[PDB]
Coordinates of C-alpha atoms and ligand atoms in Angstrom, one line a residue:
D4 CA 19.0 22.1 11.9
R5 CA 19.9 24.7 9.3
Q6 CA 20.9 21.7 6.4
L7 CA 17.3 20.4 7.9
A8 CA 15.5 23.7 7.2
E9 CA 17.2 24.1 3.5
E10 CA 16.3 20.6 2.2
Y11 CA 13.0 21.2 3.4
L12 CA 12.0 24.1 2.7
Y13 CA 13.7 23.3 -0.6
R14 CA 11.7 20.0 -1.7
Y15 CA 8.4 20.7 0.1
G16 CA 7.8 24.1 -2.0
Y17 CA 8.8 27.1 -0.6
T18 CA 12.3 28.3 -1.5
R19 CA 10.9 28.8 -5.2
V20 CA 7.7 30.7 -3.9
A21 CA 10.5 32.6 -1.4
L30 CA 15.4 31.6 5.1
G31 CA 12.9 34.0 6.9
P32 CA 10.6 34.8 3.8
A33 CA 10.7 31.0 3.4
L34 CA 10.1 30.2 7.7
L35 CA 7.0 32.9 7.8
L36 CA 5.6 30.8 4.4
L37 CA 5.9 27.6 5.8
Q38 CA 4.7 28.6 9.2
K39 CA 1.4 30.0 7.4
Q40 CA 1.5 26.6 6.0
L41 CA 2.1 24.3 8.5
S42 CA -0.6 26.8 11.6
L43 CA 2.6 27.8 13.6
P44 CA 3.4 31.1 15.5
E45 CA 4.7 33.1 11.8
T46 CA 7.8 33.9 14.1
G47 CA 10.4 34.2 10.6
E48 CA 12.7 31.8 13.1
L49 CA 14.3 28.4 12.4
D50 CA 12.6 28.3 16.1
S51 CA 11.5 25.1 18.1
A52 CA 8.4 24.7 16.9
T53 CA 9.7 25.2 13.5
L54 CA 12.1 22.3 14.1
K55 CA 9.6 20.1 16.0
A56 CA 8.2 20.5 12.6
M57 CA 9.9 19.7 10.3
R58 CA 11.5 16.3 12.1
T59 CA 7.9 15.4 11.7
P60 CA 6.8 12.5 9.2
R61 CA 4.7 13.6 7.0
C62 CA 3.0 13.9 3.6
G63 CA 6.0 13.5 0.3
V64 CA 3.1 15.6 -1.7
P65 CA 4.7 19.8 -2.3
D66 CA 3.1 22.2 0.0
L67 CA 3.3 25.3 -2.6
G68 CA 3.3 24.5 -5.8
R69 CA 3.2 21.3 -7.5
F70 CA 5.4 18.5 -8.6
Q71 CA 5.5 19.1 -12.0
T72 CA 2.9 20.1 -14.7
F73 CA 0.3 17.6 -14.7
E74 CA -2.6 17.4 -18.1
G75 CA -6.5 18.5 -17.1
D76 CA -8.1 20.2 -14.8
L77 CA -7.2 17.7 -11.3
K78 CA -10.3 16.4 -10.9
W79 CA -12.3 12.8 -12.1
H80 CA -14.3 13.3 -15.1
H81 CA -16.5 10.3 -14.4
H82 CA -17.3 8.5 -10.4
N83 CA -16.9 5.1 -10.7
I84 CA -13.1 5.0 -9.3
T85 CA -10.6 1.9 -10.0
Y86 CA -7.6 0.7 -7.9
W87 CA -4.9 -2.0 -8.7
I88 CA -3.4 -2.7 -5.8
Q89 CA 0.0 -3.4 -7.8
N90 CA 2.6 -5.0 -5.0
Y91 CA 2.6 -5.4 -0.8
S92 CA 4.0 -4.7 1.4
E93 CA 5.4 -7.7 3.4
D94 CA 4.9 -5.5 6.7
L95 CA 1.0 -7.3 6.7
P96 CA -1.2 -9.2 5.6
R97 CA -2.4 -9.6 2.4
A98 CA -5.9 -9.3 3.4
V99 CA -5.2 -6.5 6.1
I100 CA -4.1 -4.3 3.8
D101 CA -6.7 -4.6 0.9
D102 CA -9.6 -3.8 3.4
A103 CA -6.8 -1.0 5.1
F104 CA -7.7 1.1 1.6
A105 CA -10.9 -0.4 1.5
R106 CA -12.1 1.3 4.8
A107 CA -9.6 4.2 3.7
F108 CA -11.5 4.3 -0.2
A109 CA -15.0 4.0 2.2
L110 CA -14.4 7.3 4.3
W111 CA -14.2 9.0 0.4
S112 CA -17.2 7.5 -1.5
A113 CA -19.8 8.4 1.4
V114 CA -19.5 12.3 0.8
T115 CA -18.8 11.7 -3.1
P116 CA -20.7 10.5 -5.5
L117 CA -17.3 8.4 -6.3
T118 CA -17.4 4.4 -5.8
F119 CA -14.3 3.0 -5.7
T120 CA -13.8 -0.4 -7.2
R121 CA -10.8 -2.8 -6.6
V122 CA -9.2 -4.5 -10.4
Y123 CA -6.2 -6.4 -11.0
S124 CA -5.2 -4.5 -14.4
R125 CA -2.7 -1.4 -14.7
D126 CA -5.4 0.2 -16.6
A127 CA -6.9 1.7 -13.2
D128 CA -7.9 4.9 -12.3
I129 CA -5.7 4.9 -9.1
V130 CA -2.6 2.7 -9.2
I131 CA -1.1 1.1 -5.5
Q132 CA 2.7 0.5 -5.0
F133 CA 4.9 0.1 -2.2
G134 CA 8.0 0.8 -3.2
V135 CA 11.3 2.4 -1.6
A136 CA 14.1 5.6 -2.2
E137 CA 13.6 5.9 -6.1
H138 CA 11.2 3.7 -7.5
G139 CA 10.2 5.0 -10.9
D140 CA 8.8 8.0 -11.1
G141 CA 11.4 10.7 -10.3
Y142 CA 10.3 11.7 -7.1
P143 CA 12.7 9.1 -4.6
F144 CA 11.6 7.9 -0.9
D145 CA 13.8 8.4 1.9
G146 CA 14.3 5.5 3.5
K147 CA 12.5 5.3 7.0
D148 CA 10.4 8.0 8.8
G149 CA 10.3 11.6 7.3
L150 CA 8.1 11.5 4.1
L151 CA 6.0 8.4 4.1
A152 CA 4.0 8.3 1.1
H153 CA 2.7 10.7 -2.2
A154 CA 0.1 10.7 -4.9
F155 CA -1.1 12.7 -8.5
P156 CA -4.0 14.4 -8.5
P157 CA -6.5 13.0 -11.0
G158 CA -5.7 12.4 -14.7
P159 CA -4.0 9.6 -17.3
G160 CA -1.5 7.5 -16.0
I161 CA 0.6 7.9 -13.0
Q162 CA -2.0 11.4 -11.9
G163 CA -4.1 9.2 -9.8
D164 CA -1.4 7.0 -8.2
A165 CA -0.5 6.7 -5.0
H166 CA 3.6 5.4 -3.3
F167 CA 3.4 4.4 -0.6
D168 CA 7.0 4.2 1.4
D169 CA 7.9 0.8 2.2
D170 CA 11.2 1.9 4.2
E171 CA 8.2 2.3 6.7
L172 CA 6.9 -0.5 8.9
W173 CA 3.5 -0.3 8.0
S174 CA 0.9 -1.1 10.8
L175 CA -2.4 -1.0 12.1
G176 CA -2.8 0.1 15.7
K177 CA -1.4 2.3 18.4
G178 CA 2.3 1.5 18.8
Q179 CA 5.4 1.1 16.3
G180 CA 5.5 2.4 12.7
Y181 CA 2.3 4.2 10.9
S182 CA -0.9 3.3 10.1
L183 CA -1.6 2.1 6.5
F184 CA -5.4 3.3 6.4
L185 CA -4.5 6.5 8.0
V186 CA -2.3 7.6 5.5
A187 CA -3.6 6.3 2.1
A188 CA -6.8 8.2 3.1
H189 CA -4.7 10.7 3.3
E190 CA -3.2 10.4 -0.2
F191 CA -6.4 9.0 -1.8
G192 CA -7.7 12.9 -1.0
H193 CA -4.4 13.5 -3.1
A194 CA -5.7 10.9 -5.6
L195 CA -9.4 12.4 -5.8
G196 CA -7.4 16.7 -6.5
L197 CA -7.3 17.8 -2.6
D198 CA -4.3 19.8 -2.0
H199 CA -2.5 20.1 1.5
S200 CA -5.2 22.0 4.5
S201 CA -3.9 24.3 6.9
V202 CA -6.0 22.8 9.9
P203 CA -3.4 20.9 12.3
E204 CA -6.6 18.0 12.9
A205 CA -7.7 17.9 9.6
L206 CA -6.6 14.1 7.7
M207 CA -5.8 16.3 4.5
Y208 CA -3.1 18.8 6.9
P209 CA 0.6 16.9 5.7
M210 CA 2.5 15.5 9.1
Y211 CA 1.1 12.5 10.3
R212 CA -0.2 11.5 13.6
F213 CA -2.2 8.8 14.3
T214 CA -5.5 8.9 15.5
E215 CA -8.5 6.6 16.8
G216 CA -10.7 9.3 15.9
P217 CA -13.1 9.8 12.5
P218 CA -10.4 10.5 9.6
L219 CA -12.2 13.1 8.4
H220 CA -12.6 16.6 8.8
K221 CA -14.8 19.7 8.1
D222 CA -12.3 21.2 6.2
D223 CA -11.2 17.6 4.1
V224 CA -15.3 16.9 4.0
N225 CA -15.3 21.1 2.5
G226 CA -13.2 20.6 0.0
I227 CA -13.9 17.1 -0.9
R228 CA -17.5 18.5 -1.9
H229 CA -15.6 22.0 -3.3
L230 CA -15.2 19.4 -6.7
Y231 CA -18.1 16.7 -6.2
Ligands
CA301 CA1 10.3 7.9 4.5
CA302 CA1 -3.0 6.5 -12.4
CA303 CA1 8.1 -1.9 5.0
ZN304 ZN1 -0.3 15.1 1.6
ZN305 ZN1 6.3 7.8 -5.8

């Protein structure tokens, strides 16, 4: 347990900012009871599959002010997981973008070139950016804030079983909608029901909540 805590608090930025004080920062950030203790609710939280983007701080120094300055956003589906038919993957990403296009002045268009603003990639372990995935479960995906090159891109851990219904695996639609939020410039939310909360929860309800819309509206 203390080894899991050490790795979680390190990976997601709490240890850098700071086990008590770092656990307090995590409990505040995740809206858990703020005991300062490695207790059952905190351990359950740490064992919950979630987004690979850090909570406090950032992957790295990025370029620019971290939002898009044009409105026709392009995305490239660089490769495909074998877990779902191509057309089902295409439609999952299209629906995830449709969530954000309704609440922003942005449009999203699928392109077939590396030139895209948002390059979407499936990969496993170390997949080319120095931020390796971790095998099945754990972190499910990550993305990078708007800007040039890797910025704006969205990566999905193909050691996960990608699905869409209730049942085994993880909803590619829900995780993509979350990661696309980062690709548009959002940080994680501390509201457990919000789309931009970092933990994965399956739902058949509408993914966007007030906090997500408030955040994207603030930017655009
Ligand atoms: Ca994983
Ligand atoms: Ca990019
Ligand atoms: Ca997979
Ligand atoms: Zn995230
Ligand atoms: Zn990556």
